[PDB]
Design a protein around this ligand. Structure first.
Ligand SMILES: Cc1cccnc1-c1csc(C(=O)Nc2cc(Cl)cc(NS(C)(=O)=O)c2)c1
Ligand SMILES: Nc1ncnc2c1ncn2[C@@H]1O[C@H](COP(=O)(O)OP(=O)(O)O)[C@@H](O)[C@H]1O
Ligand SMILES: [Mg+2]
Length: 855
């Protein structure tokens, strides 16, 4: 499209030239001929292979707080006292609690129970152990208890502190709350969880800490201090952080052979892990399972006499089935889930007349919420006959526990669940399974910066373990919604995350923990990542100045490594602190770790939701506005909060988690030397002119880069690549069917590129051309009249202004490096550097680009 004109005032034009002359930067001269455009865009230490240090549990050391015990009963108490005190407390609890006895009886029926003696024997004599058994035997909930009680009953409760790693956030919290119940406790006594931005630490001795691997790695700066056993759960799922930890722990096992690693896996080939850990023993666990009659899409269409509404493996069909079964299946698009058939399959399950729950496997939040409303709109699937419980990570823990509840007699329990119900948790009374045969994976391509949340085909392993969910109670049934032809064009195993995930967050961990070369360390992985991913990670971190030319951790990189956030968002927060808008930026950063706090239900945003935006045309401004209004409503107590959150249609749980995350991000910046006065909550207006919010949007543009786009007409936008895309339906910038939005700038930075039959941009914020050139661009080529931004945008703007705004970028990044050496210096900055920040504040203003949002 034709270049967008930028109306820079003459006063601003000269101010930019002044500060560049004061900063001792030259204006790169124009090109001799417009044909050749000039580009305006402008330690000696090494590490060796070291091991993470280890030490066993002490009496006076708290492993969770990583501190000494000076005051309290266990201050200077002996290991022998503690051992008896905890034993006597447990032995008294068991005989005085008839409710705990009933629970302790349920435990001793679990298939894993009859292997207890063997597991304890293996772990006691061998460093590393693999506990292999079918999903639902009780590996996760019982093994850590067997190990703890074995030390308690034998008067060694002081010599036991267990770490249990889980792949998912909800697994670590659920299991903590479940094992707590199984000991008649709440989390905080002998059982605790530690996840990103949430923790209930357990007691200092005879304790189990359930956690995500990410948390554990961030706490290993000091080393594995005061831990006897490290249990790595659900290794078969091949979480990238789990794979990485197994590299770290194998080095720990070798240097400190007294430590006790315990790997626990579903029914897969564990030779790869066995060989990796020096041919360690494999304890086989198993209970009674029933043969499950497995059906494919052909069987499902024939048994139900189904007819769909008005390469592809549906066009291929077995010749042993009926003619109409062939013709019906043909009309089903395999890149959809057959919603109407699942509804018809539920009806068939009734006709069989054998009471049991139906576990439906769907990919992601989107298709489960679609399946739910689809059913409930049919009165037949009401409370009278049916109980439809959704099961994904983003549900409240109130509703996640309701899947385990028995239902009233003559009612069917249908679980619309994700891959969480595959191997992580087992549901009881499951006789029926409907497998969509799909997975939702986070595929990232760094060349165009596309976050592809794609629905892809599951493996034979997945189908085999999804089938196994039906055969725990009685002879079950599994309904695969994939052709017999498709089952052949399916892989044996899924691509492990290590092969298809960005490694820059693992690369910082490697350097922070001082484990040597990024490539050197990652070469020791059980299945090393692709070369191009390691090169990309090293390049990305060198660009941010997180690493130097020798690939060693800079003072900036050290901060980014300690922040549990995308390194680029980490740098955005550091810059926020220099501009004294740290709190706002910490809020924005935190918000990216949780779902949108707005309850939309799929439909476009109403008045209430859009009113938070103001005149800024920003989902990010809307989010900050919600937090300013919600934080005020909190002062009226817990009930006033619930009334505000329900009146405005906000997820109160999401706002609380985000705020707690913001406080923890703020905490790490303080500990890094940043002053508190640059992180104080500041009042702002989302309609009136506000210079603090102008800067916040500028630093936002830096953060989400290279997610920039240009608006065409209606919902159509063109991306960084120069390809057409759509404004997401959930955005405040998304118009209604008719009324076209007159945007005062066609430019937008945004959060992520959700791919669904097209390119859609979610979490959109309006930016001015000055912000584009300053923070939201790398390559800028000028021909004297027209500048070319990243070879996809042309601006009819002054050559001197473009070179000067590009000057400020380099000046700003130069200041960040100087600030990260001693963050205290942001309070007392050089007069020239304060004048450079004031000039960034100036071009941040809408007025500086000839725009008035009020009009
Ligand atoms: C609340 C508080 C007050 C003071 C200090 N710290 C915390 C805290 C918040 S979260 C947390 C944690 O996650 N600690 C933690 C987890 C894991 Cl998984 C292991 C180990 N111990 S170690 C390194 O492995 O020896 C330790 C501690
Ligand atoms: N929150 C819970 N509510 C009810 N039962 C549960 C809960 N968590 C686990 N269980 C039960 O514990 C048993 C084993 O669970 P788990 O330890 O996760 O097994 P594994 O890790 O071997 O697959 C199952 O019968 C399951 O139903
Ligand atoms: Mg398990």
């Amino acid at each position: 499209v034709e270049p967008y004109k930028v109306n820079l005032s003459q006063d601003l034009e000269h101010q930019l030239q002044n500060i560049i002359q004061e900063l001792n930067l030259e204006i790169l001269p124009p090109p001799e001929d417009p044909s050749v455009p000039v580009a305006l865009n402008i330690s000696q230490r090494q590490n060796q292979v070291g091991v993470v240090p280890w030490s066993p549990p002490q009496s006076n050391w708290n492993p969770w707080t990583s501190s000494n015990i000076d005051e309290g009963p266990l201050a200077f108490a002996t290991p022998e006292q503690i051992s008896m005190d905890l034993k006597n407390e447990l032995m008294y609890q068991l005989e005085q609690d008839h409710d705990l006895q009933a629970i302790l009886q349920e435990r001793e029926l679990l298939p894993v129970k009859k292997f207890e003696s063997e597991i304890l024997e293996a772990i006691s004599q061998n460093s590393v152990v693999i506990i292999r058994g079918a999903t639902g035997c009780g590996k996760t909930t019982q093994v850590p208890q067997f190990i703890l009680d074995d030390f308690i009953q034998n008067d060694r409760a002081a010599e036991c502190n267990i770490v249990v790693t889980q792949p998912r956030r909800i697994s670590a919290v659920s299991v903590a709350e479940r094992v707590a119940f199984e000991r008649g406790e709440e989390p905080g006594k002998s059982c605790g969880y530690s996840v990103r931005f949430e923790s209930i630490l357990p007691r200092p001795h005879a304790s189990i800490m359930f956690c995500t691997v990410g948390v554990l790695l961030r706490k290993l700066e000091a080393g594995i201090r005061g831990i006897s056993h490290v249990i790595v759960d659900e290794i078969h799922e091949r979480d990238i952080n789990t794979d990485f930890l197994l590299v770290v722990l194998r080095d720990v096992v070798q240097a400190y052979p007294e430590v006790r690693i315990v790997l626990m896996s579903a029914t897969i080939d564990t030779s790869m892990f066995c060989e990796y850990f020096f041919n360690c023993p494999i304890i086989e666990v198993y209970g009674r399972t029933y043969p499950v009659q497995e059906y494919f899409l052909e069987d499902c269409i024939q048994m139900t006499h189904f007819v769909p509404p008005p390469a592809n493996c549906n066009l291929i069909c077995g010749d042993e089935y009926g003619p109409e079964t062939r013709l019906s299946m043909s009309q089903l698009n395999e890149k959809e889930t057959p919603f109407e058939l699942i509804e018809a399959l539920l009806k068939y399950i009734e006709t069989l007349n054998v009471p049991g729950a139906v576990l439906v496997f769907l990919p992601g939040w989107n298709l489960i919420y679609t399946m739910q409303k689809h059913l409930e709109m049919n009165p037949h699937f009401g409370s009278h006959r049916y109980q439809i419980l959704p099961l994904h990570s983003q549900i409240p823990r109130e509703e996640q526990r309701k899947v385990f509840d028995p239902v009233p007699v003559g009612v069917t329990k249908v679980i619309l669940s994700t891959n969480i119900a595959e191997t992580s948790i087992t549901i009881n009374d499951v006789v029926y399974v409907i497998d969509s045969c799909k997975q939702k994976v986070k595929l990232f391509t760094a060349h165009n910066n596309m976050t592809n949340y794609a629905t892809v085909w599951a493996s034979k392993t997945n189908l085999e373990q999804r089938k196994g969910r039906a055969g725990r109670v009685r002879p079950g049934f599994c309904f695969h919604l994939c052709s017999r032809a498709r089952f052949e064009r399916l892989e044996t195993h899924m691509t492990p995350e290590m092969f298809r995930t960005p490694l820059h967050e693992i690369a910082l961990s490697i350097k922070l923990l001082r484990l040597g070369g990024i490539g050197q360390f990652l070469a020791k992985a059980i299945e090393p990542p692709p070369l191009d991913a390691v090169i990309e990670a090293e390049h990305t971190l060198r660009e941010l100045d997180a690493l130097d030319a020798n690939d060693e951790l800079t003072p900036l990189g050290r901060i980014l490594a300690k922040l549990p956030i995308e390194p680029r968002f980490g740098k955005m927060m550091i810059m926020g602190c220099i501009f004294y808008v740290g709190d706002a930026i910490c809020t924005i950063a935190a918000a990216t770790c949780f779902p949108e706090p707005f309850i939309n239900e799929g439909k476009r945003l109403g008045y209430i939701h859009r009113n938070f935006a103001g005149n800024r045309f920003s989902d990010h401004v809307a989010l900050l506005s919600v937090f300013q209004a919600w934080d005020d409503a909190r002062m009226g107590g817990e009930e006033a909060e619930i009334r505000f959150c329900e009146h405005k249609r906000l997820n109160m749980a999401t706002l609380r988690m985000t705020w707690e995350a913001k406080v923890q991000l703020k905490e790490i910046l303080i500990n890094s030397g940043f002053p508190e006065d640059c992180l104080l909550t500041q009042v702002f207006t989302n309609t009136g002119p506000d210079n603090n919010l102008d800067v916040v949007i500028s630093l936002l543009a830096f953060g989400v880069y290279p997610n920039v786009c240009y608006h065409k007409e209606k919902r159509k936008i063109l991306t960084t690549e120069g390809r057409n895309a759509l404004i997401h339906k959930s955005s405040v910038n998304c118009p209604f069917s008719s009324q076209d939005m007159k945007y005062p700038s066609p430019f937008f930075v945004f959060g992520e590129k959700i791919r669904t039959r097209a390119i859609s941009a979610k979490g959109m914020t309006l930016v001015t051309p000055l912000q584009l050139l300053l923070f939201a661009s790398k390559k800028v080529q000028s021909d004297g009249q027209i500048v070319l931004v990243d070879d996809w945008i042309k601006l009819q703007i002054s050559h001197e202004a473009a070179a000067c705004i590009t000057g400020l970028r380099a000046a700003m990044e130069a200041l960040v490096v100087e600030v990260t050496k001693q963050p205290a210096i942001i309070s007392q900055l050089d007069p020239v550097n304060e004048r450079m920040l004031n000039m960034i504040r100036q071009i941040s203003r809408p007025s500086a680009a000839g725009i008035n949002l009020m009009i």
